[PDB]
Symmetry: C3
Subunit: 262 residues, 3 copies
């Protein structure tokens, strides 16, 4: 756990422009691993915040007309500042509104990681694709979709699912950690977007190892939290997830990581 040690020591300022359902959970997840979250949404303070920040998360869960301009503006401010952007195109497949916005954003700014479930990333690369908010199952290959998305955007792609897929540069990786209770907790993937941002340390082209570690730290903590004897369900799980992220050590991480290339 190279990068996590550095997060706990350096306390990286991690800006989050995220959706209204998950702000509190995202901030508590970041605080638990030692990062310094800031949910700054005013374009007027983006320049000064971004100079000293290590990453920015943009998550469009609750996109409205009031957000659209601000989001484009702060993405551009981030590019000018060399601040890496993690982008979560939540439920992009569910509306033509979200598809058009995501297209505009990816034409207006370079992002450093694109993270979503299989249907979300599919809808990005194929605008006839369709979803609810959740992901169509049996999607074709998360691996094939991630590789196609990488070729199009030349940006690291993370596809979450039963198993998680990461594509960066010439490598593709499949990870197989976590718990089913994660899917019954509303912040989870939106929180993962924030955690990934916490691992970037101002690298606009992040090392795949940093992404692998972000996802594995999150999923291993979930795994362990769900095994706790006081985990009685999705309610009690969530405080335990945060405890487990706080205490996670090298030994547990190395014992539990499940990873495979190509």
């Amino acid at each position: 756990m190279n990068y996590l040690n550095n997060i706990r020591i350096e306390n990286p300022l991690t800006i989050c422009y995220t959706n209204d359902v998950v702000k509190n959970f995202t901030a508590n997840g970041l605080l638990s691993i030692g990062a310094s979250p800031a949910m700054s949404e005013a374009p007027e303070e983006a320049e000064e915040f971004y100079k000293v920040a290590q990453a920015l998360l943009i998550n469009i869960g609750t996109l409205t007309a009031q957000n659209e301009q601000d989001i484009i503006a702060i993405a551009q401010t981030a590019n000018e500042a060399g601040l890496p952007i993690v982008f979560d195109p939540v439920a992009v497949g569910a509306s033509t509104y979200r598809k058009q916005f995501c297209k505009l954003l990816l034409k207006s700014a370079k992002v450093s990681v694109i993270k979503g479930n299989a249907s979300e990333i599919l809808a990005l690369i194929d605008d006839t694709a369709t979803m609810k908010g959740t992901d169509s199952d049996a999607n074709l290959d998360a691996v094939t979709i991630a590789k196609k998305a990488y070729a199009i955007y030349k940006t690291a792609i993370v596809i979450t699912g039963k198993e998680d897929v990461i594509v960066q540069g010439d490598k593709a990786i499949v990870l197989a950690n976590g718990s089913p209770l994660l899917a019954r907790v509303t912040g989870a993937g939106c929180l993962l977007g924030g955690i990934i941002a916490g691992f970037l340390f101002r690298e606009t082209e992040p090392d795949i190892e940093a992404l692998i570690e972000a996802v594995s730290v999150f999923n291993i903590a979930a795994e362990v939290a769900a095994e706790n004897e006081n985990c009685g369900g999705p309610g009690t799980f969530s405080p335990l997830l945060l405890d487990t992220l706080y205490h996670l050590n090298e030994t547990t991480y190395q014992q539990r990581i499940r990873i495979q290339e190509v």
Copy 2:
């Protein structure tokens, strides 16, 4: 527990336009009973979302000028789509601002359930929850749920009084704003819902609250909230049937 089994299996898409204090808790309550919550607030996507959704919740807890037009617009889009609306007129009696807005909304769109406490519903129409709920039903021709010590439901020609739940619910900020969401989860795209679905929504919620508050690890309103979510997640037919408490009136008028 006819309806709850179906929610767990079908995973109904349940749109929530609700207040900024309760969004997270409402989404988690829904997820715990197997629904699929989506807090979509842009009128620009309402048409597409609503076509495939099973209900919409409108809760005005944190109503501001920025919400007013959007809410009226999406309620109209829900009506055009045949998507049932649950309406929570939060604190409508506390300001003329809310009274005027609720009036405009109910003049602009047909809703499928109106839910509040007694003084909220009273303030809508202008202690005795049953009478108030009947009066409100006559005016709006829409199912009324009034929450209180005992809960009242009026739909079509029936009125019912329910007596489940816990005092700790009143010391948790999401509770009733969550109940609005849960009820939306039980609608399955019926614009005129069966009273049995509303009875089940309310009883599931209150029975889970009862059982959560009896848990040995419940030490107060803090620990009660996670346990409430656990208990909604696990709630079974046996516990439901053992604990439900009802009282009742048939054949009312027009």
Copy 3:
């Protein structure tokens, strides 16, 4: 615990205009001590809400162009209604945008408590450009701020500082786990509001009791045998606030004058 008993009995309507990360936790914190929170943000209902309310919290954690005017308007409405205001200038030192806004607000309205950490309050007074002839500890900063604003100052930190009228106090309760929970200080702003009972110039004893209740509850929660970290801490903090009694309070309070 004079004031806390009265909160549990009287159930004071406490209006919170606070940031989007902490609304729910602030409402639950207020509910747990017996207060009645209302997160009303429309200027259009402020006059009616404020007539019957006991305090207003204003916390600028997620300040945007859409908040600025509304916040100035409601502060003015609060002044006209005699409703006391607790003001949390979150991260004011981090941008010119926040510095200018906090200035505008404090030129536009009289607040009843100003709460922040040392570097927030220091940035407030450094930007007033009044401190001719001015390392600095919290006590000195709080006194400098009091002289400028003539308004109770609470500075949170390792030890907490309160300055009201001619007294300064240093408190030493709490837990490090508080710093690892995102609502905490923003919640303390709301708890302090809950203790004001419509006093625009609150007695320092009320402010002492607000802060000590909060920090003593945090202390006890963190000792609980089911507290395994910042996650489980938060629900136990709410439980502890709900059950906190006179005996625990008197046993644990740690307080020193100037």
